[PDB]
Point group: D2
Chain length 247, copies 4
């Protein structure tokens, strides 16, 4: 189909938005290697791999802690050996550590920056050299990267807005080869980590233009759009899928 | 896809606008589109037969974009003949550029009447009957966000007006599930702006991608926003500019 | 006094933010020409001239409806013959026409665009030719140009966001002569026309980072900064003075 | 004299932009503490302290590597004891590690992020608890945070764009106390590390609206404006001083 000849790599693909991305990209004919962080995620990752192979798509699951740069890098290396150079890189893994500014610890800072910033940069450093002409790099951001609407998200918004400059710099670095680099900014999304039924869901919905949480298919649809033929001229852009949070 | 939906596209007879109407029709929308001069009648009617001869209903409506009455009645005629519009695409626009001291009041009026008033008039006519989950898609320019050079002040002002109009529309219509977005083309290979142009090399040099885009690039972005995958995108500015702003 | 010997022109300078701007620029030593829109404001405008004169400044008050391009243009021309070339142009006049999208009229569109966009472009055209090197063009925008945040501000936000592209284009057109062009975006500001005690004041304050309305001096201080020696390298920028409305 | 009675803290204040900021804030009457990173800067920093003192200002120079968070934090604590609670914090120190994307190392990433991102966050965390109401936090960014413009600055643009979200979250975190948080974005500025006559200067100048490099005083005037009474209602903003680089 659209992605028939392409190889995709998705960090954190065993669940949530990452699972929706691997399903959409596989349904478009890409082979996908994806990572899972916890050993508890291993069985579901193997189940998802068996799921894709029962539809004729090739799939690989590689454990890799997002906090460990060596594991992220060697996971990308293993994917390359098994599937060939990746055409579509999706930096999906991230963590949301929030709270009062005076209680933030160096452990909070280090984990947030290692996962939300360093891991996408390491995967890009490992993938970019062999990336074929016309490749796609797709970072996953947040609506909080552009607007911190409330107190308590300073550390997280800083880590996500770091992706804005990295993505714009990557578009200049790789554009001569036809490789695009874009960042997608989810608004509130109904996941295990952020249920739409939560007590704070109403406070979030009130500041949206569309009065409801989004779904993982919205993020996966934007990622598939950037991965495919219609995204070939989109690069260096920040693309909100936020329900009008910024409007 | 867009089966059962009606799309309206200003300036749909040519260039980017023709690619938008063709792509939207291939996804199953019925289409009405406007053309400015009566001389375009032959091209527009041929495009209608091209659309009708693929299973779609289609209408070509003469309407000078400068005249608010013509844009409005073109929208009114489409809703009676095709039904209420689900997808409004404000594609028509004009590019008047030059030294700042040589800009005339006539240049200001035409740029603002075509690039701003016409999209606002088409929206005001369509929005009342627009079914829930409808889409408003304004066509902007990379110059709305970055001028980059001297001589485009008036055009960049008219296009950056869409930024605030589009964000306000997202708030005004979000309760009905209607989204409002603006697409910002970069350089695109058309008859009005050939990729083989006189000043092509200097413009290509400031892109991240070392070439002009194609009309299919804008048409695919509009099709994405018009379709099911765009249901949660609203109030956004989406560049398709080859990295001009990067 | 960093503006001694300079001529400033301010549209809509007889009241509110425009009056604070003209007073601040005069206190920094500029001679000032300013417009007033309605003939009903005449005596307050003439009083402001008498106040400046009683402080050693030359001053002129010129009637000009913002909707009439010819009146804005000849007001700038008259200031140039009487005071000399304009060094600092401040496009402050504007109108706030708000309401439901289905109730906006074509006359609402016409007046908003004639006043919020055309009049500043006309005044700039009239002033720019004779403007000395190092001159300053300062448009007054709105936080609604960058974020609507609520329903009912569609047209107003469109007219103000037009200034964003106009200002960036003006910086490119006039930068070789050393002339800067910037737009200032007031947030909520306490004026007689926009009271901090209004019924809608509480909805605005709740979404601010600083939990109060600003004052006209905050806008006048930003404009005085862009007008002076410290603003010589600032051009093409949008500068919020919004109390953290943009978060 | 707008800063009479205020204590200012400036990272990297021994030279370049930071030295112009410490001199300007002192001339406006603030007592000043500043850090220097290298031990080789000891003599210049102590001489600058002597220069301030001779002019009636209290001043201190504190050695502190930006890479070591404990040194950054201990410098802020030492300043609080010796001069008093900080009213104005200026995070100026940073490093520019640039080059081809394939030559970036993990060490380059670690040093860039520790100095440009972690150090400002640690300095803020130490100053914020005792910071009096109406205090000022002023981060120094880069025009490259908003526009990369060329290949080879990916890492630096990422670290600086991280300041964008950090600053917006800080504005929400501290606005209730009247503390503002802003980021200033220099364009090309004539310093020892970035000479205005240096090679490639013509390349950059050509893309500016003003056809020249700026000076360190341009950055210092913007910081002085934000520190003073006129900056009271400016918070959460990104303020370019870039010569129209972004125009």
């Amino acid at each position: 189909q659209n992605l028939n000849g392409k190889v995709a790599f998705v960090t954190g693909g065993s669940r949530g938005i990452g699972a929706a991305i691997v399903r959409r990209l596989a349904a478009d004919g890409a082979d996908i290697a994806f990572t899972y962080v916890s050993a508890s995620s291993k069985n579901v990752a193997t189940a998802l791999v068996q799921e894709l192979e029962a539809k004729g798509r090739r799939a690989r699951a590689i454990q890799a802690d997002s906090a460990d740069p060596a594991q992220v890098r060697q996971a990308v290396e293993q994917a390359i050996v098994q599937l060939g150079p990746v055409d579509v890189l999706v930096n999906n893994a991230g963590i949301f550590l929030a709270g009062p500014l005076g209680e933030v610890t160096l452990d909070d800072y280090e984990r947030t920056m290692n996962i939300n910033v360093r891991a996408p940069f390491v995967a890009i450093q490992a993938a970019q050299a062999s990336m074929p002409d016309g490749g796609r790099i797709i970072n996953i951001g947040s609506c909080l990267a552009e607007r911190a609407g409330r107190a308590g998200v300073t550390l997280y918004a800083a880590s996500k807005s770091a992706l804005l400059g990295m993505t714009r710099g990557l578009a200049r670095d790789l554009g001569a080869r036809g490789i695009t680099a874009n960042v997608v900014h989810p608004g509130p999304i109904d996941t295990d980590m952020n249920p739409a039924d939560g007590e704070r869901s109403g406070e979030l919905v009130a500041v949206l233009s569309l009065p409801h949480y989004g779904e993982v298919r919205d993020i996966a649809g934007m990622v598939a759009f950037l991965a495919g033929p219609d995204g070939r001229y989109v690069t260096g852009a920040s693309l909100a899928v936020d329900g009008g949070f910024a409007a």
